[PDB]
């Protein structure tokens, strides 16, 4: 059993440019662990599998959250610290192109369809229960949990938005964009770490 109401509760319970990004990412990594523990059955997985899932998905999980948070922000991203990233400072971080992708592929599309917080939480739970994460003890157990999430998501969408029969697939079809945006964001974060622009001795550094 995977009730969308508990997934919404998890969302509601928790919610220089490189330095601002890195500090906000470190802060939200701690929040992300609290969020995942509130997703039904996540904390029942073997501990080593929980570690693997969060290491595989933390980048997409944070992107999804700051993108949804930014749907009322004019041409920018509201970080969890309350600071903004706008196009100028994104270019200053060398991340202008990916910044534009976040706005056109994630923020604006979330705004257009008015993605709600249950929907965001369920998309994030699907990302969390990624059965392709390397080294899982039983990948199919994670696939089983993923399938219970998107079953619950679809029923929620069909009940709340029955006049939008395509809405469930429309939500799922933002996940490829989230995946490639998350890959490009991570490549920059690795670069920041390699050149010594990241705060040392952080949760963030362990994730990298």
């Amino acid at each position: 059993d995977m009730p969308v109401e508990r997934i919404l509760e998890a969302e509601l319970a928790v919610e220089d440019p490189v330095t601002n990004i890195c500090q906000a990412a470190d802060k939200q990594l701690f929040t992300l662990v609290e969020w995942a523990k509130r997703i039904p059955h996540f904390s029942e997985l073997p501990l080593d599998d929980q570690v693997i899932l969060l290491r595989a998905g933390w980048n997409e999980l944070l992107i999804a959250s700051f993108s949804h948070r930014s749907i009322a922000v004019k041409d920018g991203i509201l970080l969890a610290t309350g600071l903004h990233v706008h196009r100028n400072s994104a270019h200053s971080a060398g991340v202008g192109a990916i910044f534009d992708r976040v706005l056109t592929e994630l923020v604006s599309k979330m705004r257009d369809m008015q993605m709600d917080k249950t929907e965001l939480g369920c998309l994030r739970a699907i990302v969390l229960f990624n059965p392709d994460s390397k080294g899982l003890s039983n990948p199919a157990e994670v696939e089983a949990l993923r399938e219970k999430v998107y079953a619950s998501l679809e029923a929620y969408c069909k009940h709340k938005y029955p006049e939008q029969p395509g809405r469930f697939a429309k939500l799922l079809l933002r996940l490829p964009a989230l995946r490639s945006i998350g890959l490009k964001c991570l490549e920059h974060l690795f670069f920041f770490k390699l050149i010594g622009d990241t705060p040392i001795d952080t949760f963030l550094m362990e994730m990298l």
Binding site: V33, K37, S43, L47, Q50, V51, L54, F203
Partner: peptide, 9 residues
């Protein structure tokens, strides 16, 4: 991954 492993418990 000592930090993640700990916070999860």
């Amino acid at each position: 991954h000592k930090i993640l492993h700990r916070l999860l418990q």
